Amino acid sequence: FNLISEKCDILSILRDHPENRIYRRKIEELSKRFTAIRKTKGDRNCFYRALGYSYLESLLGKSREIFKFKERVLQTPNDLLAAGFEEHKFRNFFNAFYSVVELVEKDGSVSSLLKVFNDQSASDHIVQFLRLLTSAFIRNRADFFRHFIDEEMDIKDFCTHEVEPMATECDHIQITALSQALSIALQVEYVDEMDTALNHHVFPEAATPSVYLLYKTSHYNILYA
Numbered sequence: 269f270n271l272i273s274e275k276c277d278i279l280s281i282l283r284d285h286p287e288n289r290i291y292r293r294k295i296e297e298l299s300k301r302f303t304a305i306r307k308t309k310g311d312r313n314c315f316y317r318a319l320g321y322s323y324l325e326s327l328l329g330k331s332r333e334i335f336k337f338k339e340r341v342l343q344t345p346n347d348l349l350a351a352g353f354e355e356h357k358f359r360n361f362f363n364a365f366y367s368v369v370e371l372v373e374k375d376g377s378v379s380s381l382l383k384v385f386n387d388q389s390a391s392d393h394i395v396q397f398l399r400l401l402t403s404a405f406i407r408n409r410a411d412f413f414r415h416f417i418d419e420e421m422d423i424k425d426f427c428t429h430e431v432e433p434m435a436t437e438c439d440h441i442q443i444t445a446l447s448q449a450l451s452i453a454l455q456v457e458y459v460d461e462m463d464t465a466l467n468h469h470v471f472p473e474a475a476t477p478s479v480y481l482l483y484k485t486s487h488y489n490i491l492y493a
């Protein structure tokens with residue numbers, strides 16, 4: 269369990285910033301709304317790894333929601349091809365993602381899913397798939413991202429340098445794009461060391477979340493409501 273941990277009580281993360289006044293207050297506040305946490309490895313891939321594990325976990329035993337998600341996943345090669353990715357170069361990563369979706373369906377256990385996301389090879393193939401899909405979705409909707417995010421940004425260079433390569437850190441744009449690309453509703457709780465409110469953002473604005481993430485020190489951990 270070196271990539272995604274066993275479930276721990278929320279207050280078990282006080283030990284990560286001992287005698288830190290503000291961290292202690294915000295973690296105590298968070299413990300009133302959430303029961304448990306899983307920790308992720310800080311290797312630059314933890315947003316993709318955390319979202320992929322937590323969303324698939326949320327599908328276990330839900331036969332309609334699994335069917336709908338599989339239908340969307342089967343179309344994702346078309347998104348990749350429209351953005352200029354070649355099938356022979358994305359094949360291995362798409363096959364790995366489809367495989368773990370089938371595991372959710374056929375096996376249906378937390379323990380089997382956690383074993384795949386802690387297998388360095390399977391887990392990294394899943395992350396690489398999610399990175400290529402994020403890049404495709406941004407590229408195919410370049411005018412949307414320029415209009416609403418940043419009129420001055422270079423979309424092709426940002427995707428080449430800050431989305432596709434393993435171990436590149438995320439910002440707001442990659443979170444919005446992957447949420448939209450897979451229709452995953454997520455809530456991020458923000459914990460910094462400033463004497464401010466514990467606060468959250470929902471992706472997209474409307475939504476009832478499937479996934480809750482804690483963001484704390486360029487890092488994303490998984491929360492349980």
Ligand SMILES: *CC(=O)NNC(=O)c1ccccc1Cl
Pocket residue numbers: 309310311312313314315437485486487488
């Ligand atoms: C989400 C993710 O992997 N964040 N990365 C880290 O936690 C990290 C990687 C390199 C140096 C420092 C840190 Cl915090």
